[PDB]
Symmetry: D2
């Protein structure tokens, strides 16, 4: 229930859209046509700036020539972007979260096909909504993110995920057998298809398919959900956000495991490797249409079919 | 997290009408009155035909300042509470204190339970350690429930359950969250629980185990008519309002912690929030380890 | 499977309470009379003031043969049952016939329902087809339940399920379940449900049971809010004989309901013996058992709908 | 159902996993007892080829008195009359895979965990074997699934008979799977998610149990369909009559292939145009039980699976 307050009037907006999608080509230009008409800097990923349809078109004008390239080189500074506009499904928002590994500017996501969960706004009558979110204030949800450190026995890698982290099997057929520690204490041993460590944002994601309870994104917590546990008594856990999970292979594990962050960058976990999961200090602010509760329940009713008569 | 020092004031709560608790209680009192403590007991406790008739314990029973639930002076005059028995005793102790709750140190004599982490064996050392003020504390949040039909206010530790009660023919109940109709429950009923109640009755309805340090409120349907009514978790700061559906024919029944079951008819509403007076429960070693040990031993969670 | 030889007499059942069923009932009775059929009705609907107080019916109302519940053994008296209303009407019809049940065709006026496949629109063609023996039937198995007190016995027959719970009392139930004299388990919690595959989509579904096609010979045991996390609904062969009784350590009674009608108390020494009845209900399907069952799953309880 | 021998059994087959070492002594003791009981003992060629079984001076006589079990010609000539399995349920699955036709009665022994398909305990095995030789021992006719894969490249068709289940999943790739599931030519649904499991009642306590299915007694004639992590909250496991003919095939709008596994082996890819036909095999596996089908099933359910323990 936090209103979007600007210390200074926003002037630079980063626009992110799913590539290799013709249906998104026409709206995107229009959005930029409005943003240039509003006298604002527009940042576009150079990957799609070179697309033949985007470049070789009559829509060049003063928009394409003024498409400032996004600072994809290293990280530059996140203060160069005031807020982010996403076109497409929740995958676009996940990609935007992956792009910004530090402080994330407020994100205003638009949906063109299904409503989804991370895309509350609708592209119809987008001019009024954009003007309201720029001049006036809008409700935002500070969706927490998971900070993950993978240690190979010692190479270290760091990621930040928004939906979940899935530790499962890969090409192997034997059910995975891993050990989960919480604050240095061996909380449990997961035997079966795998385990999911998710944020409340990811509660309605793939974690929901495994039987986890739907959690409002304003609840500070971390969900542990087993994918097809071997035991009947394994019930999903909800633990405080301040804890530090550590997932390892059991000392008697015959084979390896595979870890995926938001469905991408799937990498193998062997003996001596560890996955440390905490709550990140850089949550993603997602701009809501009316209010967090109403938007969340509307998405539950539409994206899922939660409690339909 | 950690607890401060301990002055000389102890309230002892035990399950009434249970012979097996007679021997430990007095023994505990024998240790409490031994060094510096003042033992408070209920009026009914002194009315037991066996506690008072004990000639050996009669000398100790003289210094048995009776606990009267009169006003806030009782709360200010008690430093911490010792409970003997199952989780029902701790629920009773929570019901006694509708305001600020002194820290609760619960012992178990039979099953381990979730709210009774301590074991009565070698209790002297544990009590002395608690007196020294070196014990972990879990601030279990409680629900403030207002029933409007005349208004009544209740403090709930485990959960509130709305169901058919003595009647039958399951009805329709509308759930309002911050004034917005979010859903309509159809089935055996609904459970609005706190994280401490996650392992309670709410667990039997398919809810998820939630650590008591998570600020949240759980809504869990008891046998919902639809197949997609998955239990939900909402922020602690919200204000639930529960009313009978305007098209409902028969009434419903609401129970707080399994006691004081009362009927809800048309025009009656139930307002549920997060109480600002949480119950502090003393931990054996630490919140996480104690919670997982209780989860493994009581519910046999992930035993295989 | 299919069947033939269903001419002549037909029984009609509808919701006893007055509702919008009056006009469809009158139209159906008129059409059946026009087809030289014999229409049986229960004495309750004849005494209804709305049905009797109209000049439109006249001879049709005068030709309504009354249906004796148990005075006459209705073996060849009824060769066809037509139900109007929801699944409750079909449950009532099952309750009426404690022995062999004639084939039953059910029409729905509100929700589709699992037990009401036919639609009242264009009912003349459907009734003509079912008269000519050109429809497929599903033999829904039923439970034979005997309640033994402490000497008297009862002989209930159930189509959906039998539910054992805490009833009007508030204390949670602690009961014991035996199969063929061997103690299966102890149910602690809100209660237990013993259901037929027909009742799988009923109240048993709300307790987490699996949807079972009514052509599977089986008996489902499903716990209502079990105290243990590992209690999972089970399916046992139809030939077994369940026996449910209060545990000797129980401090309070339980309550048993048969399709939510006879909420009667079960005390110490009372037993409930459940078997698979040898008198199944021959429901009539529109197209075929599989397609009708999956259509009902899609419509009634929105299932795998995306 | 109880064992009824037209003639007194004389030839038995012993099956054990060729990777463990703790089974050598029980295998030797069982073979010596069977030879002493005037019985013919069959083993697979891999058992004879084992460097440890053959290199035993004490066991040399019975090793030379063995009789190798040819994989072929066993269906035409019903030489095997009684099967004994040593090890976990995987040994019984392997024994089922060996016999693609009529299966002789199977008496499974467990050496570690109790399991589900291994009813007997090796302690006092001599008395149990003597009782099962001629005495009326109750058996359970566990139904099996006949699964044929039609692969369009004039299309090669394979055929398998599974005991536990058949699992269609995303395989060693992809993120989600969309597979259309039919029944008697009528499209049931479109499984969209991690995958689907088509299982027998015997497999109800297998992998299918981990996916949320319901425990089914192996005497119930049925086929279970259980979704592995369905994308919809409303997908609930189905139980369909054993006489149906399931047809699973990739959706015409699918982009990536799927993978099918039969009892965790022979994991093969399913592409566009390929179909999987699943029916009841009509060649059930008779598993010999210790006391009684219901009692043994509930004992295994309580011990191995910790079902409703308080």
């Amino acid at each position: 229930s936090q209103r979007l307050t600007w210390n200074k009037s926003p002037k630079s907006v980063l626009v992110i859209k799913k590539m290799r999608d013709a249906s998104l080509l026409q709206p995107f230009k229009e959005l930029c046509t409005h943003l240039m008409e509003e006298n604002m800097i527009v940042y576009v990923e150079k990957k799609v700036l070179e697309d033949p349809a985007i470049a070789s078109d009559e829509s060049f004008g003063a928009v394409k020539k003024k498409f400032c390239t996004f600072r994809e080189d290293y990280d530059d500074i996140s203060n160069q972007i005031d807020f982010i506009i996403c076109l497409g499904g929740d995958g676009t928002l996940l990609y935007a979260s992956s792009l910004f590994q530090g402080s994330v500017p407020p994100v205003m996501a638009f949906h063109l096909g299904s409503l989804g969960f991370l895309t509350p706004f609708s592209f119809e009558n987008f001019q009024s909504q954009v003007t309201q979110v720029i001049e006036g204030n809008a409700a935002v949800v500070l969706r927490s993110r998971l900070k993950v450190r993978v240690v190979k026995e010692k190479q270290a890698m760091q990621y930040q995920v928004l939906n979940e982290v899935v530790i499962d099997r890969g090409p192997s057929s034997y059910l995975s057998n891993v050990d989960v520690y919480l604050d240095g204490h061996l909380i449990t041993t997961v035997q079966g298809d795998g385990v999911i460590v998710s944020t409340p944002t990811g509660s309605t994601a793939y974690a929901a398919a495994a039987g986890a309870s739907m959690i409002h994104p304003n609840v500070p917590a971390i969900m542990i959900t087993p994918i097809c546990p071997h035991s009947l008594s394994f019930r999903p856990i909800v633990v405080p956000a301040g804890v530090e999970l550590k997932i390892m292979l059991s000392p008697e594990a015959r084979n390896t495991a595979w870890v995926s962050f938001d469905g991408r960058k799937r990498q193998e976990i062997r003996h001596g490797d560890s996955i440390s999961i905490t709550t990140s200090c850089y949550p993603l602010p997602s701009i809501c249409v009316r209010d967090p509760v109403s938007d969340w329940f509307e998405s539950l009713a539409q994206c899922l079919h939660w409690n339909v008569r």
